[PDB]
């Protein structure tokens, strides 16, 4: 069970995996606790590798401390970061739009070198944003998640290349540092090795060794075997170490004198002065592993070294020499091979702690520049650490990371699953990551070092395929950023329980077998020839002794959102991709019933998503409500879990939390106590269970279209709540200040009935499109009046009414009730921006029922819009008179290759009507492999087939023969799975039985009311006079180039002339068209578009005389 309040979901699992699913937000939480250096991280860092427990801030400060001047005569050195309490709790910050912060404090110490003093202060380093309980950040009230990023680890990357002009291998090596300088040793088309430092020219490597002062004799002694190094030894044409140093300086610098010592220090400065070259701890560990340069000494001295350079060059020449291994003098031997830049040994994961540490460090760079600009200039024995330190670049750097970066994303939540999979998500495009314009299609591809470390199914389906992935279920991140994976080691056929986490290189060291293998629960693989995974990705039947690692489970390769797909092993990977994507786009309904057929990964994925209130300590419920559960802990204390009623999510959905426990129950430590948005008794529930039929019904379910019963509309089965926010401010102007007030100029009184006495509408008023929400007027000024307007004002006695109404009107196509109005005032001492008096937000909510056009999808990528909501009478009903609910299409099933939906449908009917396999004449044959307490099941009992320990189609076939009758003696669904569907429309039975069953389908977030749009005349653009774009404004559809080619290919010249002149840019022509249409005249002749005149003025401004001529 493993969770004390779980609903009993009887599983079809035949295996028994030892490692339970981890704390799925660990990839966020443990990384951030590493950044803080909290004691909960410190004990786990004392668990292994306890010699250096250092936080993120401690590491940044230790590479910052000390900071000395140009002379070194005064040194300021930081120490000991510290955190206060948070300035405000989470819900208060989410209300008042404050960012969830906590103040830093750094014990900064200044030393004077000449006289000798300490200056120990406590510098306020800045208000620092902190991760919430659930893994997210809160920035200015909105909720933000920093998404992890894949980059290649800095190291030495040996590789070979081929040439069609040579037909020979050309090796290379790219020593990549972090923020240092690249360098390469590439064998050219001839047999010459050449140093390319900082992308300079060819420059043979014996010159570089002489720049290290290495003699030609020392090269000969080092490379006596090396033929190409010998040829470049004799072919160097420069002897004398400084004679090579000036050559290096002249190639790299040019525009500077030789001045030998300046060239002498430069090569030391460029690679070994560590304030300009820092391959990280990851870099030093990776390099020392790659060349075997270190036996057991710890990872320190993050600059480069001459021993590493000579080992690099020796490794390159032995790689070109066809060597297989190489020992280095003074280190362990290593194999000789190229390196793949897509292998997950060579691709680390810059998680959230690493990212914010990088941003803090680049803030500290400009802070240190400001310090050393300040420390030398100001007087000595007057400064203090408060004087020298300007924290403004640090706090500005963190704020410009959290706001406004391509990684700190607006946290997408319209179900708990999209939140969960929007964390733990691997991203591959950022600063220093690959852009799309430079994106190579090799990085798009999976390759067999993703097994357990990434999910090949789940990825975006647009143009960002393969870049954005997702973490696996069981994955874990090493302290260097490499991605672990748990394996059960097997010692000589005895599958142990020493669950050893393994990274990619160590996975390549050994061989790895599969969990779906015959095991007698004593180790002891029954088959000697077992499936196994070699290092390069090979699959061989190795005898069952050399197997030294087993998988922890099946479904280890898969993500979280894909592990909720039932019958995954029957789908194609494209449609499983679409199912895994569109499981993250369900909207939360108002009832949210748990699925009949599921997997094991719903309960754990909901209680780890944070959108279920979980009882912390065990006890008895003192009191329930809709707003709070006051629990009573067993030792005296009580605690109230406040609800979150009708919160608006970041994409405008429901966020209700009704309690599920009663007024006197007992709860345990970890029990689900409150079902969130998409939950039901704790487990995940994104859609409803629906009776399905797979016949093509009358052409309405044509080409992925879905028809529905009217029962879904009538019984509110599919009904989402959508909560939209509107807001307006009241800021000052040159003419005074804007005034939220009930009195609006030139307005009637029936629209001013919704408003209260001071502006805003009353809570509970149903508004339509175009109604007043906040009566707000501005001072307009004094303009001259047209004489017609003047004499009409003289006739009707109305004054000029010098204020101009620009009120907040609820825009087109939006309606519904008004939930709540939060008004912030400058007079009420709130935190408004400068010069803004009254800020007021209005939350309009509606109850979007289902309709035609709304996108629906099952859990297998079988998506489709709603074709036609039939009435409940003319819908095909069974012999029982139960009408089916939706009707799918047949031709969508086979040619898309997902009969996972058909197996889910058959198993849904079995779990719905319930079964009892008669073990009276013994247990039958298929049921023997089937576990116990599944031979009989009550109707509407939930089951669970996990992802790869699935349902076994033979056993499902045996199940469908042995289901139990509904209410009468009546078996609706035969052994094949097809019922005798009568027709609702005409009334005769359909002449062939039709597959029916129960199916899980979700309401997707692509509803029509968000998508419909129309504009006859709206706004216009500024520079060119085109109409605008997008549903937020009015905008018109982009009549692009391909539409223009289609209109030309018809030969329709006149329509193209209309579309390109008098509907966009003929600025007199627009009002002439409007006037002639309303008056009923002919459409006038078009003129010259405005965008052409703009082009003409641009070409004239580029000193091109562009005249235009008649004759």
């Amino acid at each position: 069970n493993s969770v004390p309040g779980a609903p009993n979901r009887v599983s079809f699992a035949k295996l028994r995996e030892p490692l339970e699913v981890p704390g799925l937000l660990d990839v966020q939480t443990d990384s951030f606790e590493w950044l803080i250096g909290s004691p909960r991280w410190r004990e786990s860092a004392a668990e292994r590798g306890d010699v250096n427990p250092v936080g993120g801030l401690e590491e940044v400060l230790y590479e910052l401390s000390p900071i000395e001047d140009f002379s070194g005569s005064m040194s300021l050195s930081f120490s000991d970061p510290r955190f206060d309490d948070v300035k405000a709790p989470v819900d208060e910050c989410k209300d008042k739009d404050m960012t969830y912060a906590a103040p830093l404090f750094v014990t900064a110490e200044f030393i004077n070198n000449n006289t000798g003093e300490i200056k120990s202060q406590t510098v306020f380093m800045g208000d620092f944003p902190m991760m919430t309980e659930k893994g997210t950040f809160i920035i200015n009230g909105t909720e933000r998640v920093v998404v992890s990023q894949l980059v290649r680890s800095p190291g030495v990357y040996f590789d070979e290349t081929i040439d069609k002009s040579t037909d020979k291998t050309l090796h290379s090596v790219k020593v990549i540092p972090s923020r240092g300088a690249w360098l390469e040793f590439d064998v050219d088309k001839r047999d010459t090795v050449g140093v390319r430092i900082d992308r300079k020219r060819r420059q043979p490597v014996t010159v570089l060794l002489k720049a290290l002062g290495w003699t030609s004799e020392q090269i000969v002694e080092r490379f006596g075997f090396s033929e190409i190094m010998r040829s470049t030894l004799e072919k160097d044409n420069t002897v004398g170490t400084d004679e090579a140093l000036l050559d290096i300086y002249r190639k790299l610098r040019p525009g500077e004198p030789p001045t030998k010592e300046s060239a002498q220090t430069l090569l030391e400065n460029l690679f070994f002065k560590e304030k300009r070259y820092d391959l990280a701890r990851v870099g030093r560990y990776k390099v020392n592993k790659k060349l075997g340069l270190h036996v057991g000494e710890p990872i320190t001295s993050s600059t480069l070294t001459e021993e590493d350079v000579v080992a690099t060059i020796e490794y390159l020449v032995r790689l070109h020499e066809g060597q297989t291994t190489m020992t280095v003098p003074g280190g362990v031997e290593v194999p000789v091979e190229t390196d793949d830049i897509d292998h997950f040994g060579n691709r680390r994961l810059r998680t959230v702690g690493e990212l914010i540490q990088n941003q803090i460090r680049v803030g500290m760079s400009r802070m240190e520049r400001v310090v050393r600009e300040r420390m030398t200039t100001q007087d000595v024995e007057a400064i203090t650490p408060q004087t020298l330190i300007n924290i403004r670049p640090v706090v500005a750097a963190i704020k410009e990371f959290f706001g406004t970066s391509q990684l700190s994303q607006f946290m997408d939540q319209n179900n708990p699953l999209s939140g969960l999979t929007h964390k733990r998500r691997l991203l591959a495009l950022g600063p220093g990551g690959l852009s799309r314009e430079r994106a190579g299609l090799e990085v798009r591809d999976v390759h067999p070092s993703h097994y357990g470390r990434m999910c090949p199914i789940e990825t975006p389906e647009g143009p960002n395929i393969g870049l954005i992935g997702s973490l696996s279920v069981y994955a874990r991140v090493n302290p260097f950023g490499f991605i672990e994976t748990p394996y059960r080691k097997v010692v000589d056929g005895v599958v142990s329980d020493e669950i050893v986490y393994l990274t990619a290189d160590e996975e390549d060291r050994h061989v790895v077998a599969q969990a779906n293998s015959p095991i007698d629960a004593d180790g002891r693989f029954v088959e000697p020839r077992v499936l196994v995974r070699r290092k390069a990705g090979e699959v061989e039947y190795v005898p069952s002794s050399e197997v030294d690692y087993m998988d922890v489970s099946p479904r280890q390769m898969v993500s979280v959102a894909t592990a909720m797909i039932p019958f995954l092993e029957h789908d194609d990977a494209n449609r499983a991709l679409m199912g895994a994507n569109m499981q993250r786009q369900a909207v939360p309904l108002v009832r949210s019933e748990a699925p009949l057929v599921g997997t094991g990964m719903e309960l754990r994925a909901a209680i780890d998503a944070g959108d279920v209130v979980v009882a912390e300590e065990s006890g008895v419920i003192e009191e329930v409500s809709a707003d709070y559960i006051t629990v009573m802990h067993d030792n005296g204390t009580r605690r109230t879990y406040r609800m979150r009623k009708f919160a608006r999510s970041n994409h405008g959905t429901c966020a209700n939390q009704c309690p599920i426990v009663d007024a006197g129950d007992r709860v345990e430590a970890g029990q689900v106590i409150a079902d969130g948005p998409c939950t039901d008794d704790g487990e995940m529930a994104l859609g409803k269970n629906l009776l399905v039929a797979i016949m093509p019904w009358e052409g309405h379910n044509y080409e992925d279209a879905i028809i529905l019963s009217n029962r879904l509309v009538e019984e509110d089965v599919l009904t989402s709540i959508h909560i939209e926010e509107h807001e307006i401010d009241a800021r000052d102007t040159k003419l005074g200040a804007e005034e939220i007030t009930r009195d609006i100029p030139n307005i009637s009184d029936e629209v001013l009935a919704d408003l209260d006495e001071r502006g805003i509408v009353r809570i509970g008023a149903e508004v339509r499109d175009g109604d007043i929400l906040v009566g707000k007027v501005t001072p307009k000024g004094e303009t001259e009046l047209t004489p017609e307007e003047r004499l009409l004002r003289a006739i009707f006695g109305e004054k000029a009414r010098e204020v101009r109404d620009t009120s907040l009107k609820v825009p087109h196509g939006e309606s519904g009730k008004v939930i709540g109005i939060r008004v912030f005032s400058r007079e009420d001492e709130d935190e408004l921006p400068a010069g803004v008096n009254e800020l007021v937000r209005v939350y309009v909510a509606q109850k979007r029922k289902i309709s035609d056009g709304d996108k629906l999808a099952g859990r297998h990528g079988n998506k489709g819009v709603i074709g036609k909501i039939l009435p409940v009478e003319d819908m095909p009903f069974l012999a029982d008179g139960t009408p089916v609910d939706i009707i799918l299409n047949t031709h969508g099933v086979p040619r898309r290759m997902n009969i996972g939906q058909i197996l889910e449908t058959h198993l849904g009917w079995c779990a719905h009507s319930g079964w009892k396999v008669d073990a009276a004449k013994g247990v039958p044959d298929w049921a023997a492999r089937l576990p116990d307490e599944l031979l009989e099941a009550q109707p509407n009992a939930i089951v669970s087939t996990p992802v790869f320990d699935g349902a076994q189609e033979a056993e499902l076939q045996g199940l469908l023969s042995c289901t139990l009758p509904n209410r009468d003696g009546d078996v609706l669904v035969d052994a094949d799975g097809k019922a005798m569907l009568f027709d609702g429309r005409s009334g005769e039975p359909f002449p062939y039985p039709v597959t029916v069953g129960y199916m899980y389908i979700m309401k997707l977030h692509h509803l029509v009311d968000d998508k419909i749009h129309a504009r006859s005349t709206g706004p216009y653009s500024m520079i060119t006079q085109q109409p605008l774009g997008g549903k937020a404004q009015f905008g018109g559809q982009r009549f692009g180039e391909m539409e223009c080619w289609a209109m030309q290919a018809y030969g329709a010249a006149y329509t193209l002339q209309e579309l390109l002149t008098i509907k966009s840019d003929d600025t007199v022509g627009r009002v002439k068209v409007y006037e002639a249409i309303v008056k009923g005249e002919n459409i006038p002749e078009p003129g010259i578009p405005e965008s052409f005149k703009v082009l003409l003025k641009e070409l004239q401004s580029l000193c091109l005389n562009v005249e235009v001529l008649s004759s």
Partner: protein, 54 residues
């Protein structure tokens, strides 16, 4: 936060472009130092300055 409503600092008042009668205007033929002549249409009741930035 806002609705992105732009407005350049200018006033638009739509009257009819009438051309039958206007205000009567003289013409001043200014001359620069480098032999360059320019014409400014000034009104009748209008003090014409001796110099002008052309």
């Amino acid at each position: 936060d806002r609705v992105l409503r732009g407005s350049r600092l200018g006033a638009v008042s739509y009257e009819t472009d009438r051309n039958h009668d206007l205000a009567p205007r003289q013409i001043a033929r200014y001359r620069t130092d480098n032999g360059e002549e320019f014409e400014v249409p000034f009104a009748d009741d209008a003090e014409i300055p001796g110099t002008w930035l052309c």
